[PDB]
Amino acid sequence: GEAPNQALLRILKETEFKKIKVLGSGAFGTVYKGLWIPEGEKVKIPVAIKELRTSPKANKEILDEAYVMASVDNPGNPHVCRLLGICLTSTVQLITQLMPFGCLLDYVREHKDNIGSQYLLNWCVQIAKGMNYLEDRRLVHRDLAARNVLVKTPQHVKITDFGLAKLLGAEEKEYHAEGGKVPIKWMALESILHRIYTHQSDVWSYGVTVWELMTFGSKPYDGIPASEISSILEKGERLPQPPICTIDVYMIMVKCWMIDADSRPKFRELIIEFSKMARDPQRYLVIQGDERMHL
Numbered sequence: 001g002e003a004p005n006q007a008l009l010r011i012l013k014e015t016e017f018k019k020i021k022v023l024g025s026g027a028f029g030t031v032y033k034g035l036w037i038p039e040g041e042k043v044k045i046p047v048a049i050k051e052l053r054t055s056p057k058a059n060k061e062i063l064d065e066a067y068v069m070a071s072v073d074n075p076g077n078p079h080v081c082r083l084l085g086i087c088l089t090s091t092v093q094l095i096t097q098l099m100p101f102g103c104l105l106d107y108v109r110e111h112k113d114n115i116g117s118q119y120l121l122n123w124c125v126q127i128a129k130g131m132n133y134l135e136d137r138r139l140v141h142r143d144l145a146a147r148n149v150l151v152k153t154p155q156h157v158k159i160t161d162f163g164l165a166k167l168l169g170a171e172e173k174e175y176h177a178e179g180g181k182v183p184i185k186w187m188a189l190e191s192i193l194h195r196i197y198t199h200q201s202d203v204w205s206y207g208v209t210v211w212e213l214m215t216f217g218s219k220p221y222d223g224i225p226a227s228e229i230s231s232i233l234e235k236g237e238r239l240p241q242p243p244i245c246t247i248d249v250y251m252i253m254v255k256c257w258m259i260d261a262d263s264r265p266k267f268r269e270l271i272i273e274f275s276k277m278a279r280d281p282q283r284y285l286v287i288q289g290d291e292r293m294h295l
């Protein structure tokens with residue numbers, strides 16, 4: 001058939017990593033910040049840890065969550081968060097690199113204004129480039145949003161939380177799964193209605209994600225009850241044009257949110273189309289005051 005990936009997963013002891021501060025948490029697995037010292041010594045490095053806090057339904061899913069994270073370690077992308085290691089306690093614990101500046105939503109909302117015309121355009125290039133790697137490794141992400149994009153540096157974003165991921169094999173160009181536990185707002189009507197997931201279902205999320213960035217961390221369909229996205233989408237409504245966006249940029253968001261996922265854009269085009277706009281940010285984004293400078 002194909003080729004051995006042989007991407008490896010390290011195993012570590014509950015005593016190689018302690019737990020500092022409680023970052024995110026809730027419903028599913030909770031997550032902490034901490035330091036980690038590898039076997040022996042050398043140097044000490046910061047890290048984030050996910051422990052489930054037991055259940056065959058619970059343990060079976062967190063397994064596949066970490067499985068995918070290493071199966072795509074291959075060469076590995078700088079816009080795709082790599083799996084550091086894993087420790088097997090009662091409560092299984094997952095270890096990744098720590099991203100010091102949080103996530104794009106909690107970062108964009110903080111500097112709602114005062115973000116650069118380039119920075120916004122670069123992130124589109126970045127998020128798209130990473131998703132191309134995921135698309136190339138036959139992986140869909142389903143849960144792509146600004147909440148699930150982290151910032152290593154103000155000019156470096158990555159994708160994470162493969163919690164709902166699923167690896168599409170040879171042939172089968174779609175997938176079906178749990179009839180629930182889904183983010184409806186960032187979801188495509190092809191999926192909301194038929195529980196089918198193509199690579200083009202993630203294209204839909206990309207549009208919503210960039211929309212979040214351009215709207216400076218605003219909530220898609222605020223107040224619109226989740227029960228109605230099926231109707232409001234089929235009726236025609238979509239997220240309105242962000243203020244700073246030109247017809248050129250919003251046209252991309254609209255092309256992604258088309259019903260026919262087949263006429264939706266491919267990720268490769270998104271890199272090129274957005275890489276071009278990065279070369280002239282002031283012509284494609286109308287930011288109230290440029291001149292980036294210091295803080």
Ligand SMILES: *CCC(=O)Nc1cc(Nc2cc(N3OCC[C@@H]3c3cc(F)cc(F)c3)ncn2)c(OC)cc1N1CCC(N2CCN(C3CC3)CC2)CC1
Nearest residue numbers: 023031048049050094096097098099100102103147160161
């Ligand atoms: C968008 C929300 C968020 O995640 N903020 C955030 C992010 C980091 N950096 C970070 C995150 C992660 N990942 O979380 C899940 C996926 C990934 C991950 C994957 C794993 F396999 C394991 C794992 F542990 C994590 N990975 C690495 N790095 C971060 O680290 C500094 C902190 C935060 N926080 C922002 C502030 C926020 N908090 C502040 C106060 N405020 C409340 C009023 C009380 C809002 C919440 C807490 C999260």
